[PDB]
Amino acid sequence: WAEAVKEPFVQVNPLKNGSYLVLASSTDCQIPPYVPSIVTVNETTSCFGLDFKRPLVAEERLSFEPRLPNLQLRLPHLVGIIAKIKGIKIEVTSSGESIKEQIERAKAELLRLDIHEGDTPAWIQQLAAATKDVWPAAASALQGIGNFLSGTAQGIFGTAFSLLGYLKPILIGVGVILLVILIFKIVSWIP
Amino acid sequence: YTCCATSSRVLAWIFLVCILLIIVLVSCFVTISRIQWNKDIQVLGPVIDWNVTQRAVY
């Protein structure tokens, strides 16, 4: 299962034996982001705006803690866009799924998020964020052509293109009327 | 008069070429942006394995 969340994300659970369980979108006290971890400190300090205390020395007894098997997991490239356009917690793969089945799963859905006359700049900015890891040269270009339609002047070019997009059916109609005149006017020159 | 008649002709040609280029620039942008989106969808995605040691920053 995948689910979209708000940035910045911070979760710190104090454990009973005196360690702390941390999952956080940003670094603090040398703890890496995005991967969770069990954290212990030798001297009281403030991390993620709260106090992580040094635990009381304990006596060792025979353990019964479980040790689960490790597991690599491959996710779809655009998992973030799939989770965002559902607005609920959604199933994205299985532990033991093939590359082919995994891909043919949100492909039709994703293809039909096509370019529109009404949010071309907002679309072009998604395409860049999607392309950045694949082709960084193209991303930087797309991002540029994004900010040109949005920012340059008062966004007048964005406006102009948006409007010329919505007019398409009228233009064809006129274009057709011109041909029907031109053909007649031409045929009415030949002897 | 001849200069004004010539100016009108030259203006119309540059005005025609101006449009026929804009038609070609927009048409090429729609084709390339839509293909790249298709390729973005079918790329291999990230891998996660819960290894902390791997993500250490010094």
């Binding site: 369980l21 006290c29 040398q30 703890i31 890496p32 991967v35 969770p36 971890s37 069990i38 954290v39 212990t40 400190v41 030798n42 001297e43 300090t45 040790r67 689960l68 098997p69 490790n70 597991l71 | 819960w50 290894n51 902390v52 040691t53």
Partner: peptide, 23 residues
């Protein structure tokens, strides 16, 4: 007169371990 505050080094040890499968 000139009062100043010079920084002086220090450190706190921080151990971290993994949680297979996130369980």
């Amino acid at each position: 007169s000139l009062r100043m505050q010079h920084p002086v080094p220090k450190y706190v040890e921080v151990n971290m371990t993994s949680i297979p499968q996130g369980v």
